[PDB]
Amino acid sequence: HMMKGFAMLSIGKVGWIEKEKPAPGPFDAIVRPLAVAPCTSDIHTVFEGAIGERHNMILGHEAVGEVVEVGSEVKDFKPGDRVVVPAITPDWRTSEVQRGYHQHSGGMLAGWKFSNVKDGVFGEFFHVNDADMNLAHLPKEIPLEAAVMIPDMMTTGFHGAELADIELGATVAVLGIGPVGLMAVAGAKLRGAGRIIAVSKPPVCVDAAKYYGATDIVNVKDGPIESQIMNLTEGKGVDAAIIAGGNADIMATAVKIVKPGGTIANVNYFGEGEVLPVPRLEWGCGMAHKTIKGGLCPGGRLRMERLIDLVFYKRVDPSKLVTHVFRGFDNIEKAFMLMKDKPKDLIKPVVILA
Amino acid sequence: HMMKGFAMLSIGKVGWIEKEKPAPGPFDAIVRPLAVAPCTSDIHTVFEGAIGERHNMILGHEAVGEVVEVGSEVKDFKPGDRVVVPAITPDWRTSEVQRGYHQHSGGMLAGWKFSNVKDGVFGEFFHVNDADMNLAHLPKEIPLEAAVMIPDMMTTGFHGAELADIELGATVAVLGIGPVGLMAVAGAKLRGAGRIIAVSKPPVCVDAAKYYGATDIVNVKDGPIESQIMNLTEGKGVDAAIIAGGNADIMATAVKIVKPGGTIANVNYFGEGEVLPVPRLEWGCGMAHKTIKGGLCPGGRLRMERLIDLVFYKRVDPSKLVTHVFRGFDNIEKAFMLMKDKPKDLIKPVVILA
Amino acid sequence: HMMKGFAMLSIGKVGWIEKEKPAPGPFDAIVRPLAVAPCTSDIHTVFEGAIGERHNMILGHEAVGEVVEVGSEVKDFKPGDRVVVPAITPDWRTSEVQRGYHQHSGGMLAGWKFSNVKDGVFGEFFHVNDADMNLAHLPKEIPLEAAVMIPDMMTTGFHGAELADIELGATVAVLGIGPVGLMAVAGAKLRGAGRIIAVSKPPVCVDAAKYYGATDIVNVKDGPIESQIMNLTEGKGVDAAIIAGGNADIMATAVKIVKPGGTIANVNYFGEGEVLPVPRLEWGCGMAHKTIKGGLCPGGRLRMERLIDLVFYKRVDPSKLVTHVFRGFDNIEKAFMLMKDKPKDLIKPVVILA
Amino acid sequence: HMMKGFAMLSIGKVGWIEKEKPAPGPFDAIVRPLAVAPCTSDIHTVFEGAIGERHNMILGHEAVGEVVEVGSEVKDFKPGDRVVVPAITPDWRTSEVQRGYHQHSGGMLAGWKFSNVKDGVFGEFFHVNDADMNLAHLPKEIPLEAAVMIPDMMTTGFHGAELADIELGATVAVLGIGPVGLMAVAGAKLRGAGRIIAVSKPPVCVDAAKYYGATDIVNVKDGPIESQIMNLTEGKGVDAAIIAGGNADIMATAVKIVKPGGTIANVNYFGEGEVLPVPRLEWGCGMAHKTIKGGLCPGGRLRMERLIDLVFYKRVDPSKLVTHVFRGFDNIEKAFMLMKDKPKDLIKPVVILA
Ligand SMILES: [Zn+2]
Ligand SMILES: [Zn+2]
Ligand SMILES: [Zn+2]
Ligand SMILES: [Zn+2]
């Protein structure tokens, strides 16, 4: 009745632990993973303690799997179903849900439970709260390596594009093309952007940017970002800027390149610094109408259902994000380490457990 | 001097007339057409008198052309510049512009001047009010047959999708696939729709729908729409429905297939009837939260610039709308009549003057 | 273990009956009523069968009360708590709630459960589903006759003003000034309306209208509404119109008085007709940008909490809506009858049980 | 036909100078001022060189006056008209106006022309560009000391409340109660806020705050702002926060007291510092969904007409902002200096010219 899981032992230390296999509440489900993917979040969780001290916590929160047990009141999911599990699995009966922000259901960022306040998906099984509200059915027609890009990568990048308030034909710059960065680009093509400028530090995975809708690549090795983008837009700037990675000073770049009345949409997790700087003069001394938004990705069944459809109806192919495919539980560790030691060919690895 | 122009002589009669070539005021410009396209709107105007009697009114309101004269205070356009002229050319200094509705600058629909309250583009020359605000430069790289779909077809169909409040992955139905309908399909793809259900009466121009993003074709000859669309969506309905053509009874269809909280976005010109019917029960007896919108397409310099970019950055290829291309002024009549009797191969015709 | 309740016996007949006292599930609460109100809704249900046949269904859905029993998992409400019970008490775990429409949680209007799919509040006890999500604590400082205006009247009227997209200083027309209409008048004042024109059939309850913020009274006995409003507004029309009562043709009137780009917000229950008429010409032949909205009122704890604060912080005093106050269970029968055959002094009656 | 005007001679020195009376262009008007008011902005321009060096620039930008000359094309305004002149008088024919941001018509803050790129209202005459778009008629029934609060104070404060996305019953904090702060309080009551917490530096002009709708006063002398507001709102924070004054660090306070999903609405001119700090942990490390907005107040004819109606229909009485009334041109110098330091509980002065 036991299970192995790849865990954070303490800040700096990871290892395999072994626990009682979890029991579902009346509304929850127990899922075994079919594919999983590690993210930079887990590294900052373990090695920089970006979310504080943790002890013997199974890592990972991007998984698609097979439901194996359901509580007595779970009505839409039965043992055997292939499901897509959003990284964010909020508690759906809170006053924040009545306000429309499920990401923060029960506290700030509290919709994010995996490898934060509960054991994550890097185990033989994991626990999904409120199955009927927090799982989506996975069509057979969608491959696992593509599906596992939906729980975080796709929903975050697309949320960047949602937050940017893009108008048809607007010119959009994307700052940082990690895997989320690339999805922000597809997210902008999905909101009808015209010109899409992808800005990356070397090494640039250019083909991926162009594939997902980029019209220009800006490489920081060719000069400051603000200068490159102003020159491309003949001084007008961009209608929106999506921040999908970088240091705190990238926020000032965003304000500096967005035209008045445009929007800076941040989806990046800033791990260091006490304040994120907003430049005074380039924010109009507070009046340039440059709206700044910054949000955690949506989770829950509906968001997953809606992005699955984007994948199924051939609107976006997230499989080009997957640069490494491993098989078998032992490789979960190997894949985890690839995210620390950042190589050159790497976007995102996927471990298929089958 | 004089000019040739194809006019509505009176309700029921069209023919070529002769006028003084119009002169520009200090802010206007005179354009001669390079390519023009006729629209059904002119048909409802001439043969159904949908806007009342007119006498010797040059018809047509879709053109790209060559500036030949400009007023003393026009700053961005010179004789010789190739320009895209939007169907809607409003007066930009009215209280309706400060309210955010330039389409109704000076009264309901008053932003639409060509072949409504001023002579249209089916002449050797025509008058564009407020040149710097109402003309867009045409890049050499964009062909004329494709560029002339921007003044009405592209801006209207897209406006249908803008009004529909489309969310990423939403399911969208498009009712009526004329040229405008087809652009509503492209617009829905541009707002990130997943499944897009295109509904037409036979003959369905299927290849065009599929090309611009349709995932399903509903043929009215196969049974009532509502029954077909419910069966496609396993009873759930659609998140939005864009009306781009049909009789008044199509407004009820839209309401019957949209789920509660969905949006019916109308861009169709209803030419006959006293009422457009809203079915009481399926509008929840006034409480289903099915919002209905109906709007004239945006025009002006910025709208055209933003859609030109959508063509330019390979977002939408509107050239597949153009099913008939003729050359020479004489053929304006031939093309105009093509819009009266609707044959089967016809989506949109274009007359090139060169 | 029985209880008396005032019920719809069958279509056409009401009477006091005796039922099993309800039991709460682990998430439910049992409330005894402290004050109740009858609604027109109950009339259309009983005598016109608006929601079909029913047998022994306790009527009524506006109550403030005292919790007497709670399920094992209720955390925020205990036996003894005075609470405001919203008319809409939805199931909070549905895909419609993730879409943002709890009113339609599980189907159209399904957030409306009382005297629809479950026994209403005209009993010695009634059952509130999901107490932690669907009850609000009632401060002692708020009188019961005012509090019982919050479950439907205040939230429906205010929803009318929320939907109208009222801008600061906008001119708002409210069509029909019953209790809901009067709260829409106050709703338009709370959203910053300047001029607020109240339109009523005789006898006009003017004093309440002016008291809730109306600046003009239009009496229909003095002539057609459309002609009256145009003369008041020097031909310009109104920025928004809230429909809070009338026949189906009041929709067509609303469209005729709203300026282009304005909004028609409906909160009225339309009981007869196959269609609600939208006039084609005055709706711009489908292009006047006159947006039409029609929605059921919000419910749940957060909606109630927020209106409770509006009364508590002296933003709105709903008591002037209450024209008849009785004491004792017996007078629920008398109050119900007042809703049919509506006399001249009557807005809304309240029965206090104490 | 010369005129004297109160000018910024250079950084640090002001004085009465002599200039040619300005002439109107064909669309412009010349106004003589009837009442005027100085603002802190002119101080930051004069003594801190906030907009760089200027020479012989007439100051001041809040005035209501009398039309004395009109251009050949002015159609809605004649010599003799009482007009309210908004601080922002933008050029209405730029692509930034088509995007919906007239404050930035022609560049960042470029809708603000008075005492920036043209002579301000502290002269015997001043020049209003594009009269038909930038003047509103002033009813006799509105007193001058009240009317002159509309060009800047009322429109700025209300814009703070417009930007905050306030929901009916929401809890709103206003940080800083200068004159703008007080209008922001009135703005939050006009968007239907329930609880309104006004936060000020000592000494608090309390009576004004309560008059415009404040329900709680927070004094910084009783402890840090963050600590107090958490205590008042039992840990939940406020749904929105309007910044109407303070140093750069007040932005961090704002982020710290607003709940996840709330909005920080800034209308303050931040004059010093290189960065405005957004605190990382309280901004969700980039994901708390705390939207930050910052905007220049709206201008133009319609904005003024709409605030005039709010005053006219007794929705807001701004005269309580007017604490000092002086008479005569000579007193323009005296009134200007009151704005350079903390004088009294009174603050904002008005000069009546009659
Ligand atoms: Zn992640
Ligand atoms: Zn047409
Ligand atoms: Zn009710
Ligand atoms: Zn000022």
Residue numbers in the entry:
A (entry chain D), B (entry chain A), C (entry chain B), D (entry chain C): -1 to 352
Please quote the paper that reports this structure.
Alcohol dehydrogenases (ADHs), also known as ketoreductases (KREDs), are of great industrial interest primarily due to their ability to perform an asymmetric reduction of aldehydes and ketones. Switching the cofactor preference of NADP-dependent enzymes to NAD is of particular interest due to the lower cost and higher stability of NAD, and the higher efficiency of cell-free NAD recycling systems, for which low-cost co-substrates are available. We crystallized CBADHS and TBADHS1 in order to elucidate the structural basis for the observed reversal of cofactor preference. In both cases, the size of the cofactor-binding pocket is reduced due to the substitution of residues 198 and 199 by others with bulkier side chains, which sterically prevents the binding of the 2′ phosphate of NADP.
We performed full combinatorial saturation mutagenesis of residues G198, S199, R200 and Y218 of TBADH to generate a library (TBADHLib) of 16.8 million unique genetic variants. A similar selection procedure as for CBADH was followed but using the ALPS strain, and two different variants were identified, TBADHS1 and TBADHS2. TBADHS1 had substitutions G198S, S199K, R200P, and Y218V. When the enzymatic activity was assayed, TBADHS1 could oxidize isopropanol only with NAD+, certifying the reversal of cofactor preference. The kcat of TBADHS1 for the oxidation of isopropanol with NAD+ was 112 ± 5.7 min−1, 4.5 times lower than the kcat of TBADHWT for the same reaction with NADP+. However, the Km of TBADHS1 for isopropanol was 3.74 ± 0.54 mM, a 32-fold decrease (improvement) compared to the Km of TBADHWT for isopropanol in the presence of NADP+. Overall, the catalytic efficiency (kcat/Km) of TBADHS1 for the oxidation of isopropanol (kcat/Km = 496.67 M−1 s−1) was more than seven times greater than that of TBADHWT with NADP+ (kcat/Km = 70 M−1 s−1). The resulting maps showed clear density for NAD+ in the case of CBADHS, but only partial occupancy for TBADHS1.
